């Protein structure tokens, strides 16, 4: 009966996704499922690897531009699509508080655990603001986001790059319909650059990205009673020149037979068979403008870091 419980209210979606992904001829698993407690902690670690420049690069821009962004938006409500990295969130909240504008915070995530942490953290640090955690998939459940106040919706970390172009276009269009006049969108997009720098960012020496990738198998093992042997799958990251995107795979070292008991499903991996677990699309600055335009959104500002590694867009 409680609004807070409705908003914070997945298991069905994982079942559907795992069945479809593992029974396809080209096997795949969606990257939205990487970020359980263990995966989120590993992502955290990823944000501090020397190879993985995106987080600190976008953080650098936000540290410099948050006050400008807040000034331009005039928003009183921060909506974050995909939570879990509060260092960036705090920068925008601080600026909104500085401006005497901050009334409300709405974190949005597919993982209920991540929402609780962010809600608790921001709740303790920002007195006198309304907090509504919204649990959902940003490809399906944007409607669950309350339509209140003037909302600055932020979608950082190049998470938009984890959508392929058709789903990405549908996401932007649905996002645009959810925004009301006066609302603003802040979008982070990692940029095309040296291909070796790109591959290494998803294939670090410390082996952390590999553990992060293999952890999706642990999620499925736990949630659906499967028996993936994690060490039997090799992490592989590749650049796709045609699509200008990183592609992340798990490759079976030897033939594998996997029983997914909760789905009453048995699946086979040939030796050398690869399963797609993520893409990370890299953008050209002029194209972000075009993709936003297609969705009916008008980019009003573009910022980049001092090295030009990463892009941040403000639109209405
Ligand atoms: N399809 C989806 N719907 C809702 N949340 C998603 C999602 N796919 C990934 N996420 C969430 O988004 C986060 C991505 S990693 C952290 C992103 C953070 N905003 C940053 O910039 O660093 C995770 O918490 C993950 O659970
Ligand atoms: N949004 C992040 C997510 C990510 C970082 N490292 C990964 C490794 C595998 C899959 C996804 C990721 C990115 O594409 O940069």
mmCIF file of C-alpha atoms and ligand atoms in Angstrom:
data_model
loop_
_atom_site.group_PDB
_atom_site.id
_atom_site.type_symbol
_atom_site.label_atom_id
_atom_site.label_comp_id
_atom_site.label_asym_id
_atom_site.label_seq_id
_atom_site.Cartn_x
_atom_site.Cartn_y
_atom_site.Cartn_z
ATOM 1 C CA UNK A 1 0.000 0.000 0.000
ATOM 2 C CA UNK A 2 2.960 2.290 0.558
ATOM 3 C CA UNK A 3 4.159 4.502 -2.307
ATOM 4 C CA UNK A 4 7.753 4.004 -1.138
ATOM 5 C CA UNK A 5 7.313 0.241 -1.390
ATOM 6 C CA UNK A 6 5.687 0.442 -4.830
ATOM 7 C CA UNK A 7 8.478 2.668 -6.161
ATOM 8 C CA UNK A 8 11.172 0.407 -4.668
ATOM 9 C CA UNK A 9 9.432 -2.808 -5.784
ATOM 10 C CA UNK A 10 12.910 -8.304 -11.816
ATOM 11 C CA UNK A 11 13.153 -11.987 -10.920
ATOM 12 C CA UNK A 12 10.838 -12.575 -13.880
ATOM 13 C CA UNK A 13 12.941 -10.324 -16.101
ATOM 14 C CA UNK A 14 16.123 -12.221 -15.225
ATOM 15 C CA UNK A 15 14.422 -15.565 -15.969
ATOM 16 C CA UNK A 16 13.216 -14.306 -19.350
ATOM 17 C CA UNK A 17 16.638 -12.785 -20.201
ATOM 18 C CA UNK A 18 18.651 -15.831 -19.173
ATOM 19 C CA UNK A 19 16.432 -18.263 -21.064
ATOM 20 C CA UNK A 20 16.470 -16.151 -24.216
ATOM 21 C CA UNK A 21 20.164 -15.340 -23.989
ATOM 22 C CA UNK A 22 21.363 -18.875 -23.286
ATOM 23 C CA UNK A 23 19.122 -20.560 -25.881
ATOM 24 C CA UNK A 24 20.119 -18.215 -28.734
ATOM 25 C CA UNK A 25 22.552 -19.560 -31.354
ATOM 26 C CA UNK A 26 24.864 -16.688 -30.504
ATOM 27 C CA UNK A 27 24.629 -16.902 -26.714
ATOM 28 C CA UNK A 28 24.411 -13.681 -24.722
ATOM 29 C CA UNK A 29 23.546 -12.289 -21.292
ATOM 30 C CA UNK A 30 22.409 -8.680 -20.739
ATOM 31 C CA UNK A 31 24.872 -6.405 -18.875
ATOM 32 C CA UNK A 32 22.135 -4.956 -16.608
ATOM 33 C CA UNK A 33 22.536 -8.073 -14.464
ATOM 34 C CA UNK A 34 26.229 -7.519 -13.644
ATOM 35 C CA UNK A 35 25.590 -5.215 -10.700
ATOM 36 C CA UNK A 36 24.443 -7.276 -7.685
ATOM 37 C CA UNK A 37 26.293 -6.561 -4.427
ATOM 38 C CA UNK A 38 29.437 -8.376 -5.569
ATOM 39 C CA UNK A 39 29.396 -7.018 -9.105
ATOM 40 C CA UNK A 40 28.810 -3.458 -7.861
ATOM 41 C CA UNK A 41 31.765 -3.749 -5.539
ATOM 42 C CA UNK A 42 33.866 -5.019 -8.459
ATOM 43 C CA UNK A 43 32.655 -2.106 -10.611
ATOM 44 C CA UNK A 44 33.748 0.144 -7.892
ATOM 45 C CA UNK A 45 37.251 -1.303 -8.111
ATOM 46 C CA UNK A 46 37.101 -0.952 -11.902
ATOM 47 C CA UNK A 47 36.607 2.832 -11.487
ATOM 48 C CA UNK A 48 40.077 2.991 -9.887
ATOM 49 C CA UNK A 49 42.090 0.927 -12.390
ATOM 50 C CA UNK A 50 44.821 2.839 -14.317
ATOM 51 C CA UNK A 51 43.445 1.410 -17.592
ATOM 52 C CA UNK A 52 39.835 2.428 -16.889
ATOM 53 C CA UNK A 53 39.919 6.170 -17.492
ATOM 54 C CA UNK A 54 36.155 6.845 -17.944
ATOM 55 C CA UNK A 55 35.061 7.367 -14.301
ATOM 56 C CA UNK A 56 37.746 9.769 -13.148
ATOM 57 C CA UNK A 57 37.584 11.556 -16.495
ATOM 58 C CA UNK A 58 33.859 12.206 -16.262
ATOM 59 C CA UNK A 59 34.378 13.055 -12.548
ATOM 60 C CA UNK A 60 36.934 15.649 -13.612
ATOM 61 C CA UNK A 61 34.393 17.364 -15.892
ATOM 62 C CA UNK A 62 31.665 17.228 -13.267
ATOM 63 C CA UNK A 63 33.900 18.740 -10.603
ATOM 64 C CA UNK A 64 34.547 21.645 -12.979
ATOM 65 C CA UNK A 65 31.038 22.019 -14.473
ATOM 66 C CA UNK A 66 28.464 20.996 -11.811
ATOM 67 C CA UNK A 67 27.696 24.596 -10.791
ATOM 68 C CA UNK A 68 27.341 25.594 -14.428
ATOM 69 C CA UNK A 69 25.081 22.578 -15.106
ATOM 70 C CA UNK A 70 22.910 23.374 -12.099
ATOM 71 C CA UNK A 71 22.759 27.037 -13.133
ATOM 72 C CA UNK A 72 21.652 26.116 -16.652
ATOM 73 C CA UNK A 73 19.038 23.557 -15.587
ATOM 74 C CA UNK A 74 17.504 25.425 -12.648
ATOM 75 C CA UNK A 75 16.242 22.069 -11.456
ATOM 76 C CA UNK A 76 15.214 21.267 -7.885
ATOM 77 C CA UNK A 77 15.167 17.483 -8.291
ATOM 78 C CA UNK A 78 18.080 15.162 -9.172
ATOM 79 C CA UNK A 79 17.061 12.003 -10.979
ATOM 80 C CA UNK A 80 19.943 9.587 -11.522
ATOM 81 C CA UNK A 81 19.579 6.760 -13.965
ATOM 82 C CA UNK A 82 21.848 3.991 -12.747
ATOM 83 C CA UNK A 83 23.151 4.691 -9.245
ATOM 84 C CA UNK A 84 26.070 3.077 -7.431
ATOM 85 C CA UNK A 85 28.844 5.680 -7.873
ATOM 86 C CA UNK A 86 27.953 8.444 -5.465
ATOM 87 C CA UNK A 87 31.199 10.411 -5.952
ATOM 88 C CA UNK A 88 29.661 11.867 -9.093
ATOM 89 C CA UNK A 89 26.177 12.207 -7.563
ATOM 90 C CA UNK A 90 27.452 14.218 -4.610
ATOM 91 C CA UNK A 91 29.022 16.773 -6.950
ATOM 92 C CA UNK A 92 25.686 17.629 -8.480
ATOM 93 C CA UNK A 93 23.802 17.527 -5.166
ATOM 94 C CA UNK A 94 26.385 19.881 -3.602
ATOM 95 C CA UNK A 95 25.970 22.327 -6.462
ATOM 96 C CA UNK A 96 22.191 22.137 -6.207
ATOM 97 C CA UNK A 97 22.402 22.740 -2.461
ATOM 98 C CA UNK A 98 24.840 25.645 -3.005
ATOM 99 C CA UNK A 99 22.329 27.190 -5.384
ATOM 100 C CA UNK A 100 19.594 26.813 -2.757
ATOM 101 C CA UNK A 101 17.641 24.728 -5.306
ATOM 102 C CA UNK A 102 17.859 21.179 -3.972
ATOM 103 C CA UNK A 103 14.518 19.759 -2.845
ATOM 104 C CA UNK A 104 14.482 16.175 -4.001
ATOM 105 C CA UNK A 105 16.607 13.150 -4.960
ATOM 106 C CA UNK A 106 15.391 10.214 -7.050
ATOM 107 C CA UNK A 107 17.899 7.393 -7.611
ATOM 108 C CA UNK A 108 16.845 4.890 -10.260
ATOM 109 C CA UNK A 109 18.388 1.388 -10.503
ATOM 110 C CA UNK A 110 17.489 -2.179 -11.435
ATOM 111 C CA UNK A 111 19.152 -3.412 -8.233
ATOM 112 C CA UNK A 112 17.233 -2.781 -5.004
ATOM 113 C CA UNK A 113 20.424 -3.162 -2.939
ATOM 114 C CA UNK A 114 22.240 -0.296 -4.683
ATOM 115 C CA UNK A 115 19.206 1.983 -4.190
ATOM 116 C CA UNK A 116 19.103 1.369 -0.438
ATOM 117 C CA UNK A 117 22.790 2.284 -0.055
ATOM 118 C CA UNK A 118 22.543 5.484 -2.106
ATOM 119 C CA UNK A 119 19.306 6.464 -0.348
ATOM 120 C CA UNK A 120 20.865 5.968 3.073
ATOM 121 C CA UNK A 121 24.067 7.791 2.124
ATOM 122 C CA UNK A 122 22.429 10.822 0.507
ATOM 123 C CA UNK A 123 19.743 10.849 3.223
ATOM 124 C CA UNK A 124 22.396 11.310 5.899
ATOM 125 C CA UNK A 125 24.349 13.955 3.984
ATOM 126 C CA UNK A 126 21.509 16.139 2.674
ATOM 127 C CA UNK A 127 18.954 17.094 5.314
ATOM 128 C CA UNK A 128 15.554 18.398 4.370
ATOM 129 C CA UNK A 129 15.280 16.781 0.941
ATOM 130 C CA UNK A 130 12.671 14.318 -0.326
ATOM 131 C CA UNK A 131 14.076 10.922 -1.345
ATOM 132 C CA UNK A 132 12.236 8.396 -3.516
ATOM 133 C CA UNK A 133 14.153 5.328 -4.635
ATOM 134 C CA UNK A 134 12.783 3.875 -7.868
ATOM 135 C CA UNK A 135 13.538 0.266 -8.738
ATOM 136 C CA UNK A 136 13.328 -0.615 -12.413
ATOM 137 C CA UNK A 137 14.948 -1.088 -15.820
ATOM 138 C CA UNK A 138 15.626 2.218 -17.587
ATOM 139 C CA UNK A 139 14.567 0.532 -20.839
ATOM 140 C CA UNK A 140 11.056 -0.231 -19.503
ATOM 141 C CA UNK A 141 10.188 1.549 -16.258
ATOM 142 C CA UNK A 142 10.946 5.262 -16.665
ATOM 143 C CA UNK A 143 7.223 5.833 -16.089
ATOM 144 C CA UNK A 144 7.766 4.839 -12.444
ATOM 145 C CA UNK A 145 9.789 8.029 -11.966
ATOM 146 C CA UNK A 146 7.583 10.618 -10.239
ATOM 147 C CA UNK A 147 6.700 13.622 -12.417
ATOM 148 C CA UNK A 148 7.275 16.315 -9.805
ATOM 149 C CA UNK A 149 9.202 19.587 -9.586
ATOM 150 C CA UNK A 150 11.883 20.476 -12.139
ATOM 151 C CA UNK A 151 13.915 17.394 -12.794
ATOM 152 C CA UNK A 152 17.558 17.153 -13.804
ATOM 153 C CA UNK A 153 17.872 13.603 -15.098
ATOM 154 C CA UNK A 154 21.461 12.421 -15.252
ATOM 155 C CA UNK A 155 22.702 9.313 -17.021
ATOM 156 C CA UNK A 156 26.437 9.063 -16.432
ATOM 157 C CA UNK A 157 29.310 6.620 -16.871
ATOM 158 C CA UNK A 158 28.628 6.025 -20.556
ATOM 159 C CA UNK A 159 25.974 3.549 -19.420
ATOM 160 C CA UNK A 160 24.085 4.637 -22.554
ATOM 161 C CA UNK A 161 26.947 2.994 -24.460
ATOM 162 C CA UNK A 162 25.866 -0.348 -23.008
ATOM 163 C CA UNK A 163 22.870 -0.183 -25.378
ATOM 164 C CA UNK A 164 23.221 -1.089 -29.058
ATOM 165 C CA UNK A 165 21.934 1.543 -31.520
ATOM 166 C CA UNK A 166 18.283 0.453 -31.943
ATOM 167 C CA UNK A 167 17.636 -0.054 -28.207
ATOM 168 C CA UNK A 168 19.574 3.134 -27.592
ATOM 169 C CA UNK A 169 17.375 5.138 -29.965
ATOM 170 C CA UNK A 170 14.212 3.714 -28.387
ATOM 171 C CA UNK A 171 15.586 4.566 -24.953
ATOM 172 C CA UNK A 172 16.301 8.190 -25.885
ATOM 173 C CA UNK A 173 12.882 8.636 -27.476
ATOM 174 C CA UNK A 174 11.118 7.159 -24.433
ATOM 175 C CA UNK A 175 13.323 9.305 -22.210
ATOM 176 C CA UNK A 176 12.244 12.394 -24.178
ATOM 177 C CA UNK A 177 8.539 11.577 -23.727
ATOM 178 C CA UNK A 178 9.102 11.186 -19.980
ATOM 179 C CA UNK A 179 10.736 14.600 -19.723
ATOM 180 C CA UNK A 180 8.400 17.559 -19.380
ATOM 181 C CA UNK A 181 9.233 21.092 -20.579
ATOM 182 C CA UNK A 182 11.751 22.594 -18.145
ATOM 183 C CA UNK A 183 13.300 19.212 -17.337
ATOM 184 C CA UNK A 184 16.919 18.637 -18.456
ATOM 185 C CA UNK A 185 19.052 15.613 -19.410
ATOM 186 C CA UNK A 186 22.746 15.278 -18.483
ATOM 187 C CA UNK A 187 24.387 12.514 -20.579
ATOM 188 C CA UNK A 188 27.899 11.036 -20.373
ATOM 189 C CA UNK A 189 29.407 9.451 -23.476
ATOM 190 C CA UNK A 190 32.863 7.921 -23.776
ATOM 191 C CA UNK A 191 34.572 8.895 -27.005
ATOM 192 C CA UNK A 192 36.342 7.090 -29.823
ATOM 193 C CA UNK A 193 40.104 7.085 -29.289
ATOM 194 C CA UNK A 194 43.167 4.835 -29.645
ATOM 195 C CA UNK A 195 41.873 1.228 -29.947
ATOM 196 C CA UNK A 196 44.509 -0.188 -27.596
ATOM 197 C CA UNK A 197 43.588 2.273 -24.824
ATOM 198 C CA UNK A 198 39.975 1.196 -25.408
ATOM 199 C CA UNK A 199 40.661 -2.561 -25.176
ATOM 200 C CA UNK A 200 42.889 -2.255 -22.100
ATOM 201 C CA UNK A 201 40.176 -0.327 -20.268
ATOM 202 C CA UNK A 202 38.114 -3.559 -20.386
ATOM 203 C CA UNK A 203 41.046 -5.950 -19.927
ATOM 204 C CA UNK A 204 43.157 -4.630 -17.044
ATOM 205 C CA UNK A 205 46.336 -6.245 -15.714
ATOM 206 C CA UNK A 206 44.863 -6.694 -12.232
ATOM 207 C CA UNK A 207 42.241 -9.059 -13.636
ATOM 208 C CA UNK A 208 39.389 -7.113 -12.024
ATOM 209 C CA UNK A 209 37.342 -6.649 -15.192
ATOM 210 C CA UNK A 210 37.634 -10.390 -15.742
ATOM 211 C CA UNK A 211 36.203 -11.082 -12.247
ATOM 212 C CA UNK A 212 33.423 -8.572 -12.937
ATOM 213 C CA UNK A 213 32.520 -10.354 -16.199
ATOM 214 C CA UNK A 214 32.655 -13.862 -14.650
ATOM 215 C CA UNK A 215 30.476 -12.606 -11.803
ATOM 216 C CA UNK A 216 27.402 -12.515 -14.098
ATOM 217 C CA UNK A 217 27.711 -16.312 -14.067
ATOM 218 C CA UNK A 218 27.646 -16.221 -10.261
ATOM 219 C CA UNK A 219 24.506 -14.075 -10.360
ATOM 220 C CA UNK A 220 22.773 -16.652 -12.573
ATOM 221 C CA UNK A 221 24.155 -19.532 -10.435
ATOM 222 C CA UNK A 222 22.656 -18.069 -7.269
ATOM 223 C CA UNK A 223 19.430 -16.589 -8.584
ATOM 224 C CA UNK A 224 18.457 -19.476 -10.907
ATOM 225 C CA UNK A 225 20.280 -22.415 -9.293
ATOM 226 C CA UNK A 226 22.798 -22.939 -12.086
ATOM 227 C CA UNK A 227 26.202 -24.651 -12.040
ATOM 228 C CA UNK A 228 28.446 -22.448 -14.166
ATOM 229 C CA UNK A 229 32.088 -23.156 -13.364
ATOM 230 C CA UNK A 230 33.414 -19.583 -13.458
ATOM 231 C CA UNK A 231 37.053 -20.576 -14.025
ATOM 232 C CA UNK A 232 36.045 -22.496 -17.162
ATOM 233 C CA UNK A 233 35.154 -19.215 -18.869
ATOM 234 C CA UNK A 234 37.808 -16.827 -20.151
ATOM 235 C CA UNK A 235 37.285 -13.066 -20.177
ATOM 236 C CA UNK A 236 37.836 -11.547 -23.626
ATOM 237 C CA UNK A 237 37.434 -7.910 -24.680
ATOM 238 C CA UNK A 238 37.520 -6.937 -28.344
ATOM 239 C CA UNK A 239 37.171 -3.810 -30.462
ATOM 240 C CA UNK A 240 34.516 -3.861 -33.207
ATOM 241 C CA UNK A 241 35.721 -1.489 -35.917
ATOM 242 C CA UNK A 242 32.496 -1.554 -37.953
ATOM 243 C CA UNK A 243 30.269 -0.636 -35.002
ATOM 244 C CA UNK A 244 32.858 1.419 -33.091
ATOM 245 C CA UNK A 245 32.220 -0.501 -29.880
ATOM 246 C CA UNK A 246 34.011 -2.636 -27.333
ATOM 247 C CA UNK A 247 32.545 -6.121 -27.114
ATOM 248 C CA UNK A 248 32.946 -8.205 -23.965
ATOM 249 C CA UNK A 249 32.747 -12.001 -24.088
ATOM 250 C CA UNK A 250 33.041 -15.100 -21.945
ATOM 251 C CA UNK A 251 34.796 -17.889 -23.855
ATOM 252 C CA UNK A 252 34.463 -21.537 -22.856
ATOM 253 C CA UNK A 253 37.957 -23.002 -22.383
ATOM 254 C CA UNK A 254 36.642 -26.543 -22.726
ATOM 255 C CA UNK A 255 33.186 -27.929 -23.549
ATOM 256 C CA UNK A 256 30.731 -27.108 -20.740
ATOM 257 C CA UNK A 257 27.344 -28.508 -19.736
ATOM 258 C CA UNK A 258 25.285 -26.159 -17.563
ATOM 259 C CA UNK A 259 22.118 -26.993 -15.671
ATOM 260 C CA UNK A 260 19.938 -23.970 -14.911
ATOM 261 C CA UNK A 261 17.563 -25.671 -12.491
ATOM 262 C CA UNK A 262 15.170 -22.763 -11.878
ATOM 263 C CA UNK A 263 14.464 -22.602 -15.639
ATOM 264 C CA UNK A 264 14.395 -26.392 -16.110
ATOM 265 C CA UNK A 265 17.054 -25.724 -18.722
ATOM 266 C CA UNK A 266 20.221 -27.465 -19.888
ATOM 267 C CA UNK A 267 22.677 -25.674 -22.177
ATOM 268 C CA UNK A 268 25.912 -26.706 -23.882
ATOM 269 C CA UNK A 269 29.055 -24.709 -24.676
ATOM 270 C CA UNK A 270 31.421 -26.006 -27.313
ATOM 271 C CA UNK A 271 35.124 -25.600 -26.660
ATOM 272 C CA UNK A 272 35.981 -22.077 -27.801
ATOM 273 C CA UNK A 273 32.328 -20.949 -27.875
ATOM 274 C CA UNK A 274 31.916 -17.275 -26.941
ATOM 275 C CA UNK A 275 28.977 -15.642 -25.176
ATOM 276 C CA UNK A 276 28.398 -11.893 -25.441
ATOM 277 C CA UNK A 277 27.968 -10.325 -21.987
ATOM 278 C CA UNK A 278 28.304 -6.611 -22.887
ATOM 279 C CA UNK A 279 28.954 -3.954 -25.472
ATOM 280 C CA UNK A 280 30.384 -0.551 -24.709
ATOM 281 C CA UNK A 281 29.746 1.799 -27.617
ATOM 282 C CA UNK A 282 32.157 4.698 -28.165
ATOM 283 C CA UNK A 283 30.888 7.937 -29.638
ATOM 284 C CA UNK A 284 32.014 10.724 -31.929
ATOM 285 C CA UNK A 285 31.120 14.154 -30.449
ATOM 286 C CA UNK A 286 29.139 15.331 -33.512
ATOM 287 C CA UNK A 287 26.928 12.217 -33.405
ATOM 288 C CA UNK A 288 25.725 12.637 -29.820
ATOM 289 C CA UNK A 289 24.148 15.837 -31.025
ATOM 290 C CA UNK A 290 22.485 13.916 -33.859
ATOM 291 C CA UNK A 291 21.286 11.004 -31.684
ATOM 292 C CA UNK A 292 19.791 13.479 -29.208
ATOM 293 C CA UNK A 293 18.165 15.448 -32.019
ATOM 294 C CA UNK A 294 16.578 12.239 -33.438
ATOM 295 C CA UNK A 295 14.949 11.631 -30.046
ATOM 296 C CA UNK A 296 13.564 15.168 -29.961
ATOM 297 C CA UNK A 297 16.074 16.527 -27.458
ATOM 298 C CA UNK A 298 18.093 19.674 -28.096
ATOM 299 C CA UNK A 299 21.644 19.730 -26.805
ATOM 300 C CA UNK A 300 22.397 23.079 -25.196
ATOM 301 C CA UNK A 301 25.870 22.351 -23.845
ATOM 302 C CA UNK A 302 28.825 20.098 -24.584
ATOM 303 C CA UNK A 303 31.792 19.627 -22.249
ATOM 304 C CA UNK A 304 34.869 17.447 -22.448
ATOM 305 C CA UNK A 305 37.863 16.762 -20.186
ATOM 306 C CA UNK A 306 41.232 18.427 -20.852
ATOM 307 C CA UNK A 307 42.441 15.410 -22.918
ATOM 308 C CA UNK A 308 39.251 14.951 -24.890
ATOM 309 C CA UNK A 309 38.666 11.391 -23.655
ATOM 310 C CA UNK A 310 35.054 11.796 -22.545
ATOM 311 C CA UNK A 311 31.988 13.859 -23.399
ATOM 312 C CA UNK A 312 29.182 15.264 -21.289
ATOM 313 C CA UNK A 313 25.988 16.693 -22.830
ATOM 314 C CA UNK A 314 23.215 18.871 -21.402
ATOM 315 C CA UNK A 315 19.895 18.773 -23.315
ATOM 316 C CA UNK A 316 16.249 19.855 -23.115
HETATM 317 N N1 LIG B 1 18.998 -1.493 -17.560
HETATM 318 C C1 LIG B 1 19.214 -0.931 -16.381
HETATM 319 N N2 LIG B 1 18.161 -0.386 -15.683
HETATM 320 C C2 LIG B 1 18.358 0.209 -14.455
HETATM 321 N N3 LIG B 1 19.616 0.238 -13.904
HETATM 322 C C3 LIG B 1 20.649 -0.309 -14.588
HETATM 323 C C4 LIG B 1 20.478 -0.908 -15.821
HETATM 324 N N4 LIG B 1 21.688 -1.350 -16.251
HETATM 325 C C5 LIG B 1 22.608 -1.051 -15.308
HETATM 326 N N5 LIG B 1 21.975 -0.409 -14.281
HETATM 327 C C6 LIG B 1 22.557 0.098 -13.037
HETATM 328 O O1 LIG B 1 23.370 1.207 -13.337
HETATM 329 C C7 LIG B 1 24.578 1.142 -12.597
HETATM 330 C C8 LIG B 1 25.691 1.086 -13.652
HETATM 331 S S1 LIG B 1 27.414 1.110 -13.068
HETATM 332 C C9 LIG B 1 27.355 2.663 -12.172
HETATM 333 C C10 LIG B 1 26.871 3.817 -13.013
HETATM 334 C C11 LIG B 1 27.131 5.118 -12.285
HETATM 335 N N6 LIG B 1 26.024 6.032 -12.518
HETATM 336 C C12 LIG B 1 28.435 5.680 -12.814
HETATM 337 O O2 LIG B 1 28.421 6.611 -13.615
HETATM 338 O O3 LIG B 1 29.514 5.194 -12.470
HETATM 339 C C13 LIG B 1 24.479 -0.077 -11.681
HETATM 340 O O4 LIG B 1 24.044 0.257 -10.386
HETATM 341 C C14 LIG B 1 23.429 -0.942 -12.337
HETATM 342 O O5 LIG B 1 22.710 -1.765 -11.427
HETATM 343 N N1 LIG B 2 29.277 1.809 -18.296
HETATM 344 C C1 LIG B 2 30.545 1.044 -18.151
HETATM 345 C C2 LIG B 2 30.272 -0.397 -17.713
HETATM 346 C C3 LIG B 2 31.472 -1.295 -17.722
HETATM 347 C C4 LIG B 2 32.743 -0.984 -17.313
HETATM 348 N N2 LIG B 2 33.569 -2.083 -17.464
HETATM 349 C C5 LIG B 2 32.840 -3.115 -17.989
HETATM 350 C C6 LIG B 2 33.229 -4.406 -18.331
HETATM 351 C C7 LIG B 2 32.263 -5.234 -18.845
HETATM 352 C C8 LIG B 2 30.941 -4.805 -19.013
HETATM 353 C C9 LIG B 2 30.557 -3.533 -18.682
HETATM 354 C C10 LIG B 2 31.513 -2.657 -18.162
HETATM 355 C C11 LIG B 2 31.291 1.074 -19.470
HETATM 356 O O1 LIG B 2 30.789 0.628 -20.509
HETATM 357 O O2 LIG B 2 32.411 1.573 -19.509
#
